[PDB]
Design a protein around this ligand. Structure first.
Ligand SMILES: Cc1cc2nc3c(=O)[nH]c(=O)nc-3n(C[C@H](O)[C@H](O)[C@H](O)COP(=O)(O)O)c2cc1C
Ligand SMILES: Cc1cc2nc3c(=O)[nH]c(=O)nc-3n(C[C@H](O)[C@H](O)[C@H](O)COP(=O)(O)O)c2cc1C
Ligand SMILES: Cc1cc2nc3c(=O)[nH]c(=O)nc-3n(C[C@H](O)[C@H](O)[C@H](O)COP(=O)(O)O)c2cc1C
Ligand SMILES: Cc1cc2nc3c(=O)[nH]c(=O)nc-3n(C[C@H](O)[C@H](O)[C@H](O)COP(=O)(O)O)c2cc1C
Lengths: 371, 371, 371, 371
């Protein structure tokens, strides 16, 4: 059966375990198992490592669907399928070592907080990376660093078991993502596990032509969109039956509630429609000879930021409409709200991420290397 | 050639004549002729009357494109292709009398301000209708009215001939729409020119299964969306070279301008994407045996209203960014701003039009006869 | 010596204990003692009971200043000084029994969830009331109920020790307010501990002429306004030295941060200025023969709701500006944000509370008995 | 007779003539006479020229009251009383020649668009200044320029006589302000009529210690605030009796109208309270030995910008609520809306004018010479 069908069954499992996911700040072993068996943690790795090489719009749709069940579970998918793309940047040898025959789930932090000095055979890298989503269930972490004098950063492929995982993920929401800090202490990395994203993939097929920084941003949008849909579902369910003490008209019988529901539904539908429209436009040209153009990359970053922010606006409105119900820890809207306003802090999709795409639109000078 | 190509060429003619359109509060005869030649003022009339019977997504796209050239010209298309749908509600006799062989352009006011007495072979109708967009170049006006005792309103097909057109269209914007008041003074209308929208079309093909009230609302969305895209285009052109003669930065080099352009471009792209998504979903089920369901109709009204409101927000932001430039009558953004904030007053797509679609979403009792 | 000065000092103690306040969901005994010794938990009780009978603007300024140190502690003041007004509604006998000689701290839940049936010399009452802020440190709770089958509700003064306090206050924010649910089970209340707010106070001096429902709503605004000032203070402190990449381009040096700081500072200051302006206008006419008029009462509720919502907007903007800093449990802004978005759920100051003051502004029929 | 009472009487005369003011793009001679006789066009000139030397809060209150009657007439007072301040910067001779014995009304454009070559006796200046509000009824225009090669601009006091007034004020709103372009062509100006605002006033009394750039900005705030109050007045009066055809309600009987009326009224009241709060605080320290500090100047610019932008938001909400009524030229709200969205373009109070006051709030390096 198609992976989208699988994803939508796993969403329902994630929803059933969402209290435990939050409590333990990690996915239960058997939810991870389901996710692994459906191919969703390696969906975007290349064919050579026994992986679906799933088209980006389908993969992002899967992440959105899981996020509707539970934002943290969906985010773990987003990060796993973004990190998975970097498997296509490794020389065949190290790629086969780490992900061959269906093995390897990847985490990844882009911030180049490592310092790598070169030695015979590779480099020695040290550093501390926060926000290592999914590290609890990943084998490998792709981590950013600077090698020697070099001013353009690099990526090293690290084994989790060479790293120290620090218990730092004490957060408003997205608690189940376990995005703890990781520490490398003079870890040796063979040369064939060091690469530069800017040199581009070794596996040169359309999935890896799709803008890689765009995909990362979109994956955060997929998780936020699915979370916001769940929030509208929560409010609609509550509003039919929620009755005042004094004024007995239900929540749903208030014209303001009706206006707000309509406003939120159309704002979310708009953001989601732009999201998949720009993904498909970029997927089509990822099949062409030339690099996907700056114009197209920009459209992906515009839509991803718009999706995360619109999603936060939608969840905030649903939370506010629920009033005193939602302030309590037992209320589902509470967690959607907390998760929505943790997702907005991400650097790829915050308010500041609108400015560079504005520069591109206004035909102003712009460093678009990471667009 | 495709009618969409014709539409974009007519958009550039409308743009070139936009000052005269506004000054005269009417489209120039030559623009009407071009519009008429391309089939755009009758695009959605049935095959029988020598008309394209154009699919709704294509028709609405043409209106959007003309509105990019000039909002008033685009609105005229919008109202002509919405009124044209009612040609499918006329018995074959009156239909061929008024629209046969390629003749007849329609205007239409839905507000049932007419008062109609039954007589032998028809009715005699009186009333005054405002907002008769396009009456300057229409032959026929479909007008709402109540017949005798009835609580459900009806529609009469009137010849502009029998009508007193009053000079009342002195407005902030959409001046070229000439949406004057029309008066009927004891006008006899034969019975085969009286019908009820609620009894459904006579021509029972998919274009006329498409929700007719939803089409009306969307047509205003189309005009607003096209006008908003022109406003962004105006700002981007202005900001390239506007330097405040007090600082060392053009307008385009200010971080705030960049953020605002990106916010507006993504908000518009999202509204447009939703607009055409729901039209295509409704278009598909318009081919099915059953009437298009309330759920589908609701999405069209949700997206129509979101498109007009978002469009206004977008134009307001571009107007504001342009500062002291835009306050002057010679500035293109001034007119986009005036037009955008005339379009928002329309009853199908104002803030109040969110409430009923909200009642539908919260599964509350709702009169959805005109959804 | 001046109670405003004491409020400031107690604010800084509340801030030093804010982690413990949150952890324990109650104020530490020693902070309660400070608050008691300053007169802040009884500041608005009549002078007959050895209380300051403090003017409403001074009392509300004290609540706001405590809230700046810690929102929950300030909220406790707000609810204490609002409930304390009802001491003026008790017959002199029961008033000296419960509050004589400086004794008694009051809590109060207005919702008439109680059912009371008249028996001999009084009533017996049962019910469950949520949101009993401060019950951990109050002796008396004023609880709303319906007596027999009257349609206008009454208030019973209950001893906390006759109630069952359920552990239900598990919430996004305002954790230290310990606003648990309280249950009465066939509690007997003597008749001179039963009254109706609508019959007016026994102590007929200006403080008790000041609109009582207005005071309650304003007390929520005072806590939200103080929390919001602390959020801005938190962001300004952080923004000076939050450096991005791996070196210097601080958060404070971004145009958007500057524009956002300015927007928030003027919005808060505007809300605060309207808050104290309407309090002082109402204070003056509370000295006149007639009841404070509906027009004045209305201005109080408009200002209170504006203060709470604007405060939430401010805190949300400061939280967002702080990005990945604020998602972590050790960040001050996280708690301001959680607290700000618990305060907004309160029924006196939520978005729905705009509608009735709107009806008064539009001179529409309105039931203003609880304005 | 107190000047605030004269102002509020003159407001009703301006109201009665507002159609003529807009048609002619100038105040009628009879209105100018009333204004001149009340002392409002010279209210802030020093005592030595037979002027009230009116405290700034009283002056700005008068400007706000006139703007409520008609925004353009209020704007004319705003500009006259801001320009009048510069009479305190002239040496005693030419103050006497230009303004002595109660003569002289001043206009003023701060933009240093003039180029002044020094000669014997003074300078020769040429330039073209847009936005010369009130030039139609002013005798003198203070205009910005650079003298020789200085980097700090200067001000010349020009007689309208020696200027070409060009007919360029064709604008969305504020039409009555006749803020035309003025051209100086090799105009000789005695050294006596050349000064730098930065050297400070010659008349060193509190009114001229009050921040002069702050006063200019606030004066635009006063006009925008008065205009916004009139827009709410317009709406409330319309909404009592506006019933649609099938609305089963008036506009006032809709929940959304009520909530919006209350939102707009509190937002305006908040902006107005902050406005006069910071004026009074700045007025107090204008009596102290030192210059008014930067933190105080900053608060005036914050409040000024918040007043103009909030006023625009208020007028847009009232316009939108009025729906199809307000689109027509005969609708009072239409002109309030056009005027409100003309005033927002002013450089002292646009969105960009939030950035410098943000830099002061975040204690960032800032050029505060024109704050
Ligand atoms: C819940 C959450 C999870 C995140 N996960 C990642 C991740 O797996 N990889 C990554 O490069 N960034 C992730 N980020 C964003 C990073 O915070 C970012 O690299 C950086 O620390 C932003 O802070 P700065 O202003 O100091 O540059 C995540 C953010 C959030 C809020
Ligand atoms: C109606 C109106 C009247 C104005 N009057 C004046 C004036 O009398 N003196 C002045 O220095 N600026 C005045 N301005 C300010 C200009 O509009 C504003 O500076 C301009 O939009 C910004 O120009 P810049 O980009 O070159 O800095 C006025 C603005 C408006 C909208
Ligand atoms: C943190 C918090 C504390 C509150 N404290 C009180 C209180 O001490 N007394 C009171 O009448 N309401 C208080 N409220 C308001 C009540 O929460 C509100 O009346 C109740 O939830 C409405 O319930 P309903 O929707 O079932 O009618 C508080 C609200 C919050 C969010
Ligand atoms: C520029 C403009 C053109 C319009 N044209 C039409 C039209 O051709 N047919 C129609 O039924 N409504 C049209 N409307 C909608 C009207 O705003 C609305 O039907 C009516 O004015 C108000 O009815 P009421 O009395 O119930 O408020 C138009 C609105 C605008 C702003």
């Amino acid at each position: 059966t198609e992976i989208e069908i699988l994803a939508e069954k796993i969403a329902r499992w994630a929803r059933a375990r969402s209290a435990e996911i939050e409590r333990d700040r990690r996915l239960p072993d058997e939810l991870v198992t389901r996710l692994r068996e459906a191919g969703l943690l390696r969906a975007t790795m290349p064919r050579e490592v026994a992986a679906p090489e799933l088209a980006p719009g389908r993969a992002l749709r899967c992440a959105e669907a899981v996020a509707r069940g539970d934002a943290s579970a969906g985010w773990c998918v987003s990060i796993a399928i973004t990190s998975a793309l970097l498997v296509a940047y490794l020389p065949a040898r190290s790629r086969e070592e780490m992900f061959g025959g269906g093995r390897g789930v990847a985490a990844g932090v882009w911030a180049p907080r490592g310092t790598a000095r070169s030695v015979d055979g590779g480099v020695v890298v040290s550093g501390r990376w926060p926000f290592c989503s999914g590290i609890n269930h990943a084998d490998i972490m792709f981590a950013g660093c600077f090698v020697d004098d070099r001013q353009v950063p690099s990526v090293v492929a690290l084994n989790k078991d060479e790293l120290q995982v620090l218990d730092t993920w004490h957060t408003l929401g997205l608690r189940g993502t376990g995005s703890h800090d990781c520490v490398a202490d003079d870890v040796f990395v063979p040369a064939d596990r060091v690469f530069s994203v800017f040199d581009g993939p070794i596996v040169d097929r359309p999935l890896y032509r799709f803008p890689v920084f765009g995909f990362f941003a979109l994956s955060i949008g997929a998780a936020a969109l699915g979370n916001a849909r769940a929030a509208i579902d929560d409010l609609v369910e509550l509003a039919g039956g929620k009755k005042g003490l004094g004024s007995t008209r239900t929540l749903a019988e208030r014209s303001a509630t009706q206006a707000a529901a309509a406003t939120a539904e159309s704002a979310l539908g708009a953001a989601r429609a732009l999201f998949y429209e720009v993904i498909e436009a970029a997927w089509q040209v990822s099949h062409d000879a030339e690099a996907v153009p700056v114009t197209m990359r920009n459209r992906l970053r515009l839509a991803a930021t718009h999706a995360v922010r619109t999603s936060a606006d939608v969840v905030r409105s649903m939370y506010d409409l629920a009033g005193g119900t939602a302030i309590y820890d037992n209320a589902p809207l509470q967690r959607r709200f907390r998760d929505a306003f943790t997702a907005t802090a991400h650097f790829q999709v915050n308010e500041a991420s609108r400015e560079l795409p504005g520069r591109v639109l206004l035909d102003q000078p712009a460093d678009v290397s990471m667009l």
